[PDB]
């Protein structure tokens, strides 16, 4: 099994226990840790926050404890516009400078591969990733003739029908990537005004349109597109999405006035870290959609759509049955990495649950 576990750079600024450095990360836990994004400046990869060079050394030493543990840097992200990305891989001047620019960098810092997080390319881009990604690997195969372990190249891909079709030539980009992470917690989110679960496993026999919106379809689709089994990694949320209810209506179908308040540690509108959610559950009403096989919680005006131990194992089982390459956990820093908020003295409750399913077979 492969268990790619992202780590986000900025989680360091969370106050108190919220704060998480390459420190709290178990070296034996996942197989691949990906430092969440980098930046680009003067068409040459570059760091993002100020002390990255150090965090790049905190994280990469975990490998001294687990010689098999592989690390990766991701380029792109939410806070990195498509425009800047789309402007780099169409002007072959800018594309080839950026390429040549990263093997050295990744080497210098001990990263074993690069992970492209071009957050959703447009229909005018499908042609451009294709060759950006393509020859990135021509470079990587070339650098490897220097007598060293070939750098790895992977991509984070959206999981929405429309989103995939629009800007991804999966069939061809699958034969140059080492693995693909399916953002399979990409289905409901923020707000055309109904309460919904962002990462459903199955359909929910209840509504018809938006079958497209679930992990099973996303997965069958990708395989049908031509993406090999042994190269698909199914994304699993370690966080939840919050919603301020607009009405005493709580069952799914209920109105939404807005985004959910922040957690005291996470401080984002509409997002909650699993550890924050564990405290939220105290005094709550827990629910679970039987077919999508995922839970949600409500307290006061707040409505939370999230994943707990079993919902995540269930996914883990699904992943194993179709014979995928492995699982992906969005943010190690959104799990209970301190393992002090969620009752059981277990640390990284969620990411372990997956591991367990992926391990006892
Ligand atoms: C990412 O790299 C860019 C490269 O210029 C850094 O620069 C800013 O972005 C605009 C767009 O070109 C520039 O015109 C401004 O001069 C810059 N603004 C700032 C805040 O200095 C950018 O800072 C890098 N990103 C991070 C956060 O690491």
Q: What residues contact residue 305 under an 8 Å CB cut-off, 6+ apart? A: 188, 195, 196, 197, 198, 199, 240, 241, 242, 243, 294, 296
Give yes or no: residues 168 and 256 share one domain.
Answer: no
Task: Give the span between the Cα atoms of 275 and 256, in whole angstroms.
Answer: 24
Q: From ligand 1's centre to the CA of 216, what distance in Å?
A: 39
**DSSP class of residue 56?**
H
Q: How far apart are CA 198 and CA 218, in angstroms?
A: 13
- In the reported structure, the alpha carbon of residue 254 is separated from the centroid of ligand 1 by a whole-number distance in angstroms of 42
Taking each helix axis as running N to C, give the angle between helix 349-359 and helix 309-321, from 0 to 180 degrees, rounded to the nearest 10: 30
Resolution limit, Å? 2.9
Compute the distance between CA of residue 361 and CA of residue 356 in angstroms, rounded to an integer: 9
Question: Tokens for 137?
Answer: 């690997």
206 and 268 share a domain? no
Contact 137, 96 (CB under 8 A): no
At 254, list the tokens: 């209920």
* b/e map 188-212, b = 16+ CB within 10 Å: bbeeeeebbbbbbbbbbeeeeebee
Which positions ≥6 away from 210 have C-beta within 8 Å?
A: none
Range of 277's domain? 239-306
Tell me if 326 sits within 8 A of 233, measured CB to CB. Answer: yes
Tell me if residue 99 falls in helix, strand or coil.
helix
Distance 48 CA to ligand 1 centre (A): 10
How many residues comprise the chain?
Answer: 361
Residues 113 and 148 in one domain: yes
| CATH code at position 206 | 3.20.20.80
- Number of compact structural domains in the chain: 2
Q: How far is CA 47 from CA 76, 91, 100, 193, 212, in A?
A: 11, 23, 16, 38, 36
User: Cα(358)–Cα(16) distance, rounded to whole angstroms?
Assistant: 33
In this structure, the strands spanning 326-329 and 70-76 are unpaired
Cα Dmax for the chain: 65
What's the CA-to-centroid distance between 343 and ligand 1, angstroms?
A: 43
Residue nearest to atom 28 of ligand 1 (CA): 48
> Which residues surround ligand 1 with Cβ inside 6 Å?
39-41, 48
Helix (H, G, I), strand (E, B) or coil at 9: helix
Please, where are the H alpha helices in 75-202? 82-88, 92-108, 126-143, 161-167, 170-173
Token couple for 341: 């908020």
Technique behind the model? X-ray
Same domain for 92 and 190, yes or no, is: yes
Closest alpha carbon to 293 in 277, 306, 309, 311: 311
Residue 79 CA: nearest ligand 1 atom is 27
* 267 and 349 within one domain: no
At residue 220, the 3 state secondary structure works out as helix
Residue 104 CA to its chain's centroid (Å): 26
Asked if residue 234 and residue 331 are part of one domain, the reply reads: yes
Same-domain status, 329 and 270: no
């Amino acid at each position: 099994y492969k268990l790619i576990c992202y780590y986000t750079s900025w989680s360091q600024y969370r106050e108190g226990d919220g704060s998480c450095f390459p420190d709290a990360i178990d070296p034996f836990l996942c197989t691949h840790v990906i430092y969440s994004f980098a930046n680009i400046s003067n068409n040459e990869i570059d760091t993002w926050e100020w002390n990255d060079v150090t965090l790049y050394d905190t994280l990469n030493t975990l490998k001294n404890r687990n010689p098999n543990l592989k690390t990766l840097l991701s380029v792109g992200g939410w806070n990195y516009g498509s425009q800047r990305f789309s402007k780099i891989a169409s002007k072959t001047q800018s594309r080839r400078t950026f390429i040549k620019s990263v093997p050295p960098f990744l080497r210098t810092h001990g990263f074993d591969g690069l992970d492209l997080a071009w957050l959703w390319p447009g229909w005018r881009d499908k042609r451009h990733l294709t060759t950006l990604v393509k020859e990135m690997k021509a470079e990587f195969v070339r650098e490897a003739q220097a007598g060293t372990e070939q750098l790895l190249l992977s991509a984070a891909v959206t999981a929405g029908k429309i989103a995939i079709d629009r800007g991804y030539d999966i069939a061809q980009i699958s034969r140059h990537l080492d693995f693909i992470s399916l953002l399979t917690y990409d289905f409901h989110g923020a707000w055309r005004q109904t309460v919904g679960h962002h990462s459903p496993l199955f359909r929910g026999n209840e509504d018809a349109s938006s079958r497209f919106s679930n992990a099973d379809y996303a997965v069958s689709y990708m395989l049908r597109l031509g993406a090999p089994a042994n190269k698909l990694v199914m994304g699993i949320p370690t966080f939840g999405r919050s919603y301020t209810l607009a009405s005493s209506k709580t069952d799914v179908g209920a109105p939404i006035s807005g985004p959910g308040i922040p957690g005291r540690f996470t401080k984002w509108k509409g997002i909650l870290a699993y550890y924050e959610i564990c405290d939220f559950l105290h005094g709550a009403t827990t629910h679970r959609f039987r077919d999508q096989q995922v839970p949600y919680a409500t307290k006061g005006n707040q409505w939370v759509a999230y994943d707990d131990q079993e919902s995540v194992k269930n996914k883990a089982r699904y992943l194993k049955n179709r014979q995928l390459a492995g699982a992906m956990v969005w943010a190690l820093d959104l799990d209970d990495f301190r393992g002090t908020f969620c009752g059981q003295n277990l640390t990284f409750p969620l990411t372990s649950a997956i591991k367990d399913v992926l391990a006892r077979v």
